[PDB]
Amino acid sequence: PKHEFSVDMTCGGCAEAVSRVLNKLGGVKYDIDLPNKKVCIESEHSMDTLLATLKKTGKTVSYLGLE
Amino acid sequence: PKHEFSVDMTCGGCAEAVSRVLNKLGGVKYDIDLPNKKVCIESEHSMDTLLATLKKTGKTVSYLGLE
Ligand SMILES: [Pt+2]
Ligand SMILES: [Pt+2]
Structure with a gap:
């Protein structure tokens, strides 16, 4: 399942932070679009998680949303 | 007790993110200095918390350290 999130990131350090929390979670394939404040995540983890x-x-x- | 931390913040949004997780913890009085990447927290919570x-x-x- 491919989830997409809005995440209010303003600088590169903001993006790094998101990367670090997602790395620590594990079991995710993620793509971070800083200028558009979007984080796309492919994962078996629930949306809640x-x-x-x-x-x-x-x-x-x-x-x-999904897809 | 006033604890003092170095926190790698590189924009105003970085500073606000730190304030949010501190607010959610509760029981804290804090000051965030962005240019110097320092957070000072007065709290009874352990430094580990x-x-x-x-x-x-x-x-x-x-x-x-402390103050
Ligand atoms: Pt996407
Ligand atoms: Pt930032």
């Missing part, structure tokens, strides 16, 4: 992992950064997060 | 809360954000954190 991905959402909670992203919210751990303290950044504003929302769901852009 | 504080550190883990900061590290949860995906940013590079290290501990500077």
Whole structure:
């Protein structure tokens, strides 16, 4: 399943932070689009799990849907 | 007790993310200095709680000491 999220990232360090939390989660294939504030994730993890992992950064997060 | 941390923040959004995870922890009084990449926290929470809360954000954190 391929999930897409809005993540409020403003600088490269913001993007690195998201990468670090996703790395620590494991079991994910992710793609981070900094200028458009999007994080695309392919994973067997539930959307709830991905959402909670992203919210751990303290950044504003929302769901852009599947596929 | 005032704990002091180095936190690799490189934009205002980075600073706000740190404030959010601290707010959610609760029981903290803090000051975030962006240009100097320093967070100062007054709290009864253990430094282990504080550190883990900061590290949860995906940013590079290290501990500077007390005051
Ligand atoms: Pt995508
Ligand atoms: Pt940032």
